[PDB]
Amino acid sequence: GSVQIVYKPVDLSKVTSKCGSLGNIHHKPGGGQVEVKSEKLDFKDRVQSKIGSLDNITHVPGGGNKKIETHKLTFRE
Amino acid sequence: GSVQIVYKPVDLSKVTSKCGSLGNIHHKPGGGQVEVKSEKLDFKDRVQSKIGSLDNITHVPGGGNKKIETHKLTFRE
Amino acid sequence: GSVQIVYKPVDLSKVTSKCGSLGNIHHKPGGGQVEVKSEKLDFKDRVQSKIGSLDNITHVPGGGNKKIETHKLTFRE
Amino acid sequence: GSVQIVYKPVDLSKVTSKCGSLGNIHHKPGGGQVEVKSEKLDFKDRVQSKIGSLDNITHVPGGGNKKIETHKLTFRE
Amino acid sequence: GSVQIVYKPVDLSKVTSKCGSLGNIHHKPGGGQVEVKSEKLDFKDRVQSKIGSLDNITHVPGGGNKKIETHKLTFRE
Amino acid sequence: GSVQIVYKPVDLSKVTSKCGSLGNIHHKPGGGQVEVKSEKLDFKDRVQSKIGSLDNITHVPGGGNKKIETHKLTFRE
DSSP, X not given: OXXXXXXXXXXXXXXXXXXXXXXXXOOOOOOOEEEEEOSBOOBOSSOBOOBSOOEEOOOOOSOOXXXXXXXXXXXXX | OOEEXXXXXXXXXXXXXXXXXXXXXXXXXXXXXXXEEOSXXXXXXXXXXXXXXXXEOOOOOSOOOEEEEEOOOOOOO | OOEEEEEOOEEOOEEEEOOSOOXXXXXXXXXXEEEEEOSBOOXXXXXXXXXXXXXXXXXXXXXXXXXXXXXOOOOOO | OOEEEEEOOEEOOEEOOOOSOOOOEEEOOOOOEEEEEOSEEEEOSSOOOOSXXXXXXXXXXXXXXXXXXXXXXXXXX | OOEEEEEOOEEOOEEOXXXXXXXXXXXXXXXXXXXXXXXXXXXXXXXXXXXXXXXXXXXXXXXXXXXXOOBOOOOOO | OOEEEEEOOEEOOEEOOOOSXXXXXXXOOOOOEEEEEOSEEEEXXXXXXXXXXXXXXXXXXXXXXXXXXXXXXXXXX
């Protein structure tokens, strides 16, 4: 006995923005402090780690739109 | 006995914004402090970790729209 | 018995932005401080790590749009 | 004696229309007649008038929309 | 005696239209007649008027939309 | 006595149209007649008027849209 499969998704979709102006954004935080102490570290399989981080960010994108998508047809026997 | 499958989703959808102006956003927090103490760390399989972080962010996107989507046709025997 | 498979996704989609002006963004945080102490480190398989980081960023893209997508047809026997 | 003036209006208005079809329109006026008499004409400064005329206009815009605007800051001693 | 003036208007307005079809339009006015009499014409300065005329216009724009604007800062002693 | 003036307008406006088809348009006015009389014409300065005319225009733009604008800073003692 035969098998037939058809996969025809269609996408005319859009993701958009407009802006007059982004203006005089300030970013003036006071001085942060961090300490971490441990005598031994041990990492063994597929570890991801961040120890002692101190981050300042001022992102301000002119149009931060995004479109994340996936397609995953699968078959057996 | 035959099998037939058809997969025809259609998407004319949209995600949009407009803005006059984003203006004089300030970000002026006082100085933060962090301590962490432990003598031994041990991580072994598929661990994800963040120890001692201190983050300042000022994101301010001009159009932070997004469209997350997935398609997942599956079959057996 | 025969098998037939067809995979014809179609995408006319768009991701877009406009901006009048991005303006006088300041980024003036106070001086941060970090310490980390440990006497021994040990990493063994597929480890990823960040110890003692101190980051300042001022990203400000003129049009930070993105479109992440994947296709994954699979077959067996 | 400081003086400060800020003129920052914002507009997002729309003027729009739709139609299924403008169809058939007939403009068949009967034959007009015009006669005008005057012996002598003296004109100076901002004269602008028509002497005698026969105007036979058809005007069928697919969307005759309009938007008129005026911004006027003004200052003096 | 400082003086400061800021003129920062923002506009995102649209003037738009749609039509299914403008179809068939007939402009068949009957034959007009015009006669005008005057012996002598004296003109000076901003004279602009028509003597005698027969105008027979058809005007069918697929979207006759319009947008007019005026910005005027002004300053003096 | 300092004086400061900032002229920073922003525009993102659109004037647009759509049509399915402009189809068939007929402009068949009957034969007009014009006669004009005057013995002598004296003109000086900004004279601009027509003596006598027969105008028979068809005008069918696929989208007759328009946008007119004027910016005028001005300053004096």
